[PDB]
Design a binder for this molecule. Structure first.
Ligand code: FE
Lengths: 350, 350
């Protein structure tokens, strides 16, 4: 009863749920790659859970670390063989990078975005607070336009590390754009890009999000976009605040949810929030739509700290799914005070 | 108050919910195409609802029918300018048709599936009883394998007009495949294909789906795939039964849901069944992944019957979204006897 032993070992190391499928996913990934960052990517299990699993595996003799790779031992090869776990294949589409949309027609926008963002603020120095690639940004415009959520729409951008607002301005599509960010380096940069483009229908909000929305944000938008912190409670706050900015039925929201930091037991809870507390409908969930830029900022992670391989990731391993929602009769957002501080941003899953 | 008048007119014609966004979707579609089947495709509103809308628009002076095309009158154009409604754009990826998966690595499977099915049972002559293209079918295999849900897995195929089991047999991936279908022309053909391929791990079930699952199907599979009829009650039944065939947490379901026949209010109800009745998580929702073959079998539709345009579709206009779900701790299917009748394949959404 090999698998049962592995499961119990991993459970000693985390409170995140552990299933056989968990082990299997990791095992499958390992056979495809020895790179820890890719293992996390391919397994689509949360980072701390992969670290727990890999640790449990090593402890029990199933894996080794050799020439800086994570690898199956003789005993490991027997294990995957016994359970019929093959290496994880992938067929992500090479032109759209799995995004479902192609950006050929936004070639000029892409280029103008890369140029204008030459000296954008540098990212915060954590792997999970990076901004998305330019291609992601432009692919988001493409998506949102193709669903009819941009042209002559009033669009609210809640947090804009990504500089989605800049893209939106270069698109010429919206009627107006509001951005909420207290990062004054961001909002200043956004202003400058606006002045440079001559775009007049942009506004900067700086209210406290923990506080009820002001009357100039409440029910005043057609579409919002946000990237919430990966906790249920932050998703409720950020997405629910986004929903509360919407006018009424027929409006759209876009946001990112990761497999890197949120287990599928957490995803279930997030989905029940959206469908029961808010009463909206999820119209799209697109795997790895969002690709985050990698600067090697992983040195605080347990993966870096406590595992013997100390190789930085060599590609944009950190990706999130695009969720699209739409409002309907009886939909609602989250309008209460957000009464938890920095604890909003972490949970039991690290 | 133009818009409010149109909404009222449309509500006289249907019990499906009607929003300003509904009208907008349609109007947006009309400016992109005059082909009624394309209008339904681009608007992503259900067929009868689009009919209602077009009819209302026509009655109120905003649309006309000319050269077999649905077009805007002068008064219509003034309507869309006033409300800022532009033509619907689309950026679906050319290479993968939006599926997120490319099938170049499956060129041999594709060729073999087309050859082996040259003489397949001809479709039922209902636009919505069609089977999917070969490319759809191969793209499903790629998708399901990329998530680790095929290789040495036991796969339950509930209804198989699409002949997925045949693709799956040619792929060589699963440990075993069971198909439930009472259309003996199909199951016979599946047997013929299995014998021709030499595949021995295929089984045909024919039990009554309304009756509780037998002990040889209950909790015996790793993955199921089904295309349910589109009513809340039928998705509860078909998807729920598929879930009751799975072993436990960590198992996968794949099925199709359309925008053609199910309003987004309906999708909300559907996802509440999945998240609250079954306790499953939706890991992917990919628009138009499934493309159905068109043979012009639309003569029963209101669209055909009552509009002055009488052109048959010139392309594969009928498409559904791919949902993937995964089981988790506390997940459950639908194990009860179904007492409701054919009443299950019919809803007020026509
Ligand atoms: Fe593609």
């Amino acid at each position: 009863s090999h698998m049962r032993e592995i499961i119990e070992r991993v459970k000693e190391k985390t409170t995140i749920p552990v299933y056989e499928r968990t082990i299997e996913n990791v095992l499958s990934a390992i056979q495809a790659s020895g790179d820890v960052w890719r293992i996390v990517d391919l397994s689509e299990e949360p980072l701390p859970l992969v670290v727990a699993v890999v640790t449990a595996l090593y402890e029990l003799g199933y894996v080794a670390f050799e020439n800086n790779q994570v690898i199956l031992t003789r005993k490991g090869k027997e294990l995957v063989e016994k359970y019929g776990i093959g290496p994880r294949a992938d067929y992500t589409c090479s032109h759209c990078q799995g995004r479902t949309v192609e950006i050929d027609a936004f070639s000029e926008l892409l280029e103008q975005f890369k140029e204008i963002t030459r000296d954008r603020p540098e990212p915060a120095h954590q792997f999970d607070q990076a901004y998305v690639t330019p291609e992601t940004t432009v692919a988001r415009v493409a998506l949102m336009h193709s669903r009819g959520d941009l042209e002559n729409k009033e669009v609210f951008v809640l947090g804009d590390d990504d500089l989605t607002s800049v893209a939106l301005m270069l698109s010429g599509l919206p009627k107006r754009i509001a951005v909420l960010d207290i990062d004054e380096r961001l909002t200043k940069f956004i202003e400058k890009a606006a002045d440079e483009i001559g775009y007049e229908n942009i506004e900067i909000f700086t209210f406290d999000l923990r506080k009820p929305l002001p009357d100039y944000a409440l029910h005043k938008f057609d579409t919002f976009i946000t990237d919430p912190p990966e906790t249920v409670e932050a998703i409720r706050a950020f997405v629910g605040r986004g929903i509360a900015t919407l006018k009424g039925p027929g409006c759209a929201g876009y946001f990112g949810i990761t497999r890197r930091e949120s287990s599928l037991d957490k995803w279930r809870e997030i989905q029940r929030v959206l469908l029961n507390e808010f009463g909206v409908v999820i119209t799209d969930i697109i795997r790895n739509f969002n690709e985050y830029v990698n600067w090697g900022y992983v040195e605080e992670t347990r993966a870096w700290r406590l595992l013997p391989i100390k190789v930085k990731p060599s590609y944009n391993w950190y990706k999130s799914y695009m969720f699209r929602i739409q409002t309907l009769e009886g939909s609602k957002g989250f309008e209460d005070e957000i009464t938890v501080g920095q604890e909003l941003y972490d949970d039991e899953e690290s």
